Amino acid sequence: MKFTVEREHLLKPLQQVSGPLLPILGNLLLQVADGTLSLTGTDLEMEMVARVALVQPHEPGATTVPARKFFDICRGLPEGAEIAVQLEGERMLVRSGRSRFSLSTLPAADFPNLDDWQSEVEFTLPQATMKRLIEATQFSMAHQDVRYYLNGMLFETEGEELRTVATDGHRLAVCSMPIGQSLPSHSVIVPRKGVIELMRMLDGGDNPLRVQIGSNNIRAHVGDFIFTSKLVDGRFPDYRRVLPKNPDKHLEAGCDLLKQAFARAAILSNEKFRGVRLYVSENQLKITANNPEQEEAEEILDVTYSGAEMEIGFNVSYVLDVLNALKCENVRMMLTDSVSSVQIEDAASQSAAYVVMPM
Amino acid sequence: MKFTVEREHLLKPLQQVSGPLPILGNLLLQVADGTLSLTGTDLEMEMVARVALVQPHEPGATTVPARKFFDICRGLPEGAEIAVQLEGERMLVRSGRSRFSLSTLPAADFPNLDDWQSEVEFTLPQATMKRLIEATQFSMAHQDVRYYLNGMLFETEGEELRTVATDGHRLAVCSMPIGQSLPSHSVIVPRKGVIELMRMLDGGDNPLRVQIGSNNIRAHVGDFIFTSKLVDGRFPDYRRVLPKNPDKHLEAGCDLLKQAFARAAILSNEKFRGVRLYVSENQLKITANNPEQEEAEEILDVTYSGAEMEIGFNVSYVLDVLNALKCENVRMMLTDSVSSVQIEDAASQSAAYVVMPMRL
Ligand SMILES: O=C(Cn1c2c(c3cc(Br)ccc31)CC[C@@H](C(=O)O)C2)N[C@H](Cc1ccccc1)C(=O)O
Ligand SMILES: O=C(Cn1c2c(c3cc(Br)ccc31)CC[C@@H](C(=O)O)C2)N[C@H](Cc1ccccc1)C(=O)O
Ligand SMILES: [Ca+2]
Ligand SMILES: [Ca+2]
Numbered sequence A: 001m002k003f004t005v006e007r008e009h010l011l012k013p014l015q016q017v018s019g020p021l022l023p024i025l026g027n028l029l030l031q032v033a034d035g036t037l038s039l040t041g042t043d044l045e046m047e048m049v050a051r052v053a054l055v056q057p058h059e060p061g062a063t064t065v066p067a068r069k070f071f072d073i074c075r076g077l078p079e080g081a082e083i084a085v086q087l088e089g090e091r092m093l094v095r096s097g098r099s100r101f102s103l104s105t106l107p108a109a110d111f112p113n114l115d116d117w118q119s120e121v122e123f124t125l126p127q128a129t130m131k132r133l134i135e136a137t138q139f140s141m142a143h144q145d146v147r148y149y150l151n152g153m154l155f156e157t158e159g160e161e162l163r164t165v166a167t168d169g170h171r172l173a174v175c176s177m178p179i180g181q182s183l184p185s186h187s188v189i190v191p192r193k194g195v196i197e198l199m200r201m202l203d204g205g206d207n208p209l210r211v212q213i214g215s216n217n218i219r220a221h222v223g224d225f226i227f228t229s230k231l232v233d234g235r236f237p238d239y240r241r242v243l244p245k246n247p248d249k250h251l252e253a254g255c256d257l258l259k260q261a262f263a264r265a266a267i268l269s270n271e272k273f274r275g276v277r278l279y280v281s282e283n284q285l286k287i288t289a290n291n292p293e294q295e296e297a298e299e300i301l302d303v304t305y306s307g308a309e310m311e312i313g314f315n316v317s318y319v320l321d322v323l324n325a326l327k328c329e330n331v332r333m334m335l336t337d338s339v340s341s342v343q344i345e346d347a348a349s350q351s352a353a354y355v356v357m358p359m
Numbered sequence B: 001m002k003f004t005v006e007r008e009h010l011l012k013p014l015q016q017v018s019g020p021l022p023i024l025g026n027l028l029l030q031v032a033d034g035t036l037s038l039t040g041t042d043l044e045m046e047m048v049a050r051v052a053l054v055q056p057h058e059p060g061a062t063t064v065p066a067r068k069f070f071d072i073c074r075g076l077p078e079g080a081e082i083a084v085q086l087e088g089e090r091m092l093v094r095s096g097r098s099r100f101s102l103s104t105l106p107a108a109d110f111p112n113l114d115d116w117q118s119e120v121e122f123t124l125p126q127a128t129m130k131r132l133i134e135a136t137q138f139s140m141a142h143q144d145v146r147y148y149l150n151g152m153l154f155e156t157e158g159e160e161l162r163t164v165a166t167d168g169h170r171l172a173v174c175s176m177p178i179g180q181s182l183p184s185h186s187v188i189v190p191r192k193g194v195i196e197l198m199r200m201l202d203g204g205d206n207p208l209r210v211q212i213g214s215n216n217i218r219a220h221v222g223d224f225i226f227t228s229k230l231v232d233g234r235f236p237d238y239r240r241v242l243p244k245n246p247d248k249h250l251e252a253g254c255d256l257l258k259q260a261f262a263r264a265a266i267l268s269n270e271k272f273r274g275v276r277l278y279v280s281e282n283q284l285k286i287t288a289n290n291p292e293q294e295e296a297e298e299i300l301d302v303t304y305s306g307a308e309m310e311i312g313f314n315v316s317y318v319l320d321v322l323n324a325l326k327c328e329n330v331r332m333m334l335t336d337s338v339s340s341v342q343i344e345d346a347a348s349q350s351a352a353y354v355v356m357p358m359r360l
């Protein structure tokens, strides 16, 4: 196995396949075949593969090398460096300028593969749309809940919409985006680590994303990268049951102003329970907080509200999470009563919605 | 006690006094003779910041939680007016339609440092003190049992001020002339105190006044006064570890040398970090290997005319020096494989670094 490639063509591929990395799981599989260098990283649950065209002379073969060390070596070389690689006995030699390195290898035959599987559902969409869908909801996934199905994100196809749902039992985020293709009605759960990796592969360019879903796997092709993950078992909740049936009390306020006020009130909220109370009245919102030391905060804001007066408590962190996710001018809070969830949205888009349980 | 002040006139003061019993998590606030004073302490050191009060005020003193008070003021909007008044056991804070009631502890209970007399004094520019500390800070020990190493030596001699730091393995020294006749004296400043001193300096046009006592040090700059205890101990003599008449001077661009060392370091022993240098006519070869028998080699052009030699060093210590230097070219002053190396900015002898030889 031999290849010579410019540093600039290896960096991002190495970054992508090595980021999240059986000592052999700490290695990258390298394969030179048919004028292509393939780089693969896996943790047995998911896999990233990068392809890199080889325009200079090369020789076929495969090996595995320590991912972090190989990446750090390549990153450490100067801009414009050309990196010559060749296998020599048990070691992989890496040469650039008068910098030389000899890395240990493990046999390519030992590198684990995911099970083969069939694609049942496919569609393509812009990168910017997948980014939007993931960023809108990702913060609301559970982290290590014993309900394993919540440690991850729902990807649902319906009509021509792709929808993501994330919830941890206390708060929920949902976002739907049209993708201009007839889709079957289908849902899968992607594990939270796979969601993060998928997000990280979205470079910001105009390369479209191709998605393939099987019964136990999801795959995403973007540019010269292929990401594959297993799915999570279990019955995900139905976001329509979490959305308030009829939250017909509508409050509108500046996002930044609202966030600032909550963030200040939070300072004097209970350090564990983070409770704040909201008093809504005609064109006015009052937020209060207090803690076991009897310290107290009060914020009063102008808002647009024409409904009945009411009072409700929330965990302020959950609300701040939403407002930070929104990135918009004005927010709409949609209320039911003092003992029911609240729905929050961008006042100028219903494309994402957030639900927070009351305290 | 009452005052009203612009948010932006409190932020810097609040940053500075938060730097140093639960009253130690409070700040002492005092309104007197046109001035708000804020004090934070950890009983070892203390910072006092003064804010001029141009709006109506009323005298008095209290203490409030530092983190919460600082967070409220920082969270308030740009340009906000902050009105504070003491209401019984609470301190009330208001600005626009935001109101806060904070718990207080009596000012009477706020601890003072022991009184002391100044014995050595001098004034220098902030940039000079900043250079002195930054040049050497990284070589101070952290929680070493030799408590006298967990800090920095400040030494006055003639018209110069010198700092020394060492952890028992490597050493940094920096000396700057400060244009005033000083007694020959030295003290050890605790590492936490060094960091706080460093951070009180903005590099601006206010002169820094330093006062040293038997057991304390104080630094006054503009509206801020820092006071710390000294470390009551004996510091090692830096002159003892400086190599005698090193006659083999290697010179190279700092960044090229640094990047070579950083790449080589990847395949060095994770715990002991040894790398080898082979010096020859205008050439440096650096090698590294690890227990798994992986190997790195770097060859660079340098300026070097001395006898050929080999020497090993801890690459983390060498990289620490190169990162602190932030200069164009470096000088490595070599002697032989069993002697230390002295490293300097090629264009300046004001800072010097000593690293020990490793056998491999
Ligand atoms: O009992 C539930 C019901 N539930 C649930 C979810 C959810 C989402 C929102 Br925004 C509000 C309530 C939700 C989503 C996850 C559902 C599940 O267990 O599969 C249960 N959640 C509690 C928290 C809770 C307790 C009492 C009242 C409301 C919420 C929990 O997950 O620990
Ligand atoms: O004193 C020491 C250990 N030591 C010590 C210090 C020191 C600083 C540097 Br840059 C390098 C070595 C240091 C400073 C702290 C000394 C102490 O224990 O108080 C020990 N070693 C000498 C050997 C030696 C001689 C000359 C120069 C360096 C080291 C010995 O054990 O006799
Ligand atoms: Ca705006
Ligand atoms: Ca929606």
Ligand SMILES: [Cl-]
Pocket (backbone or CB within 6 Å): B255, B256, B257, B258, B259, B260, B300
């Ligand atoms: Cl270099």
Ligand SMILES: [Cl-]
Pocket (backbone or CB within 6 Å): B274, B275, B276, B287, B288, B289, B360
């Ligand atoms: Cl070596």
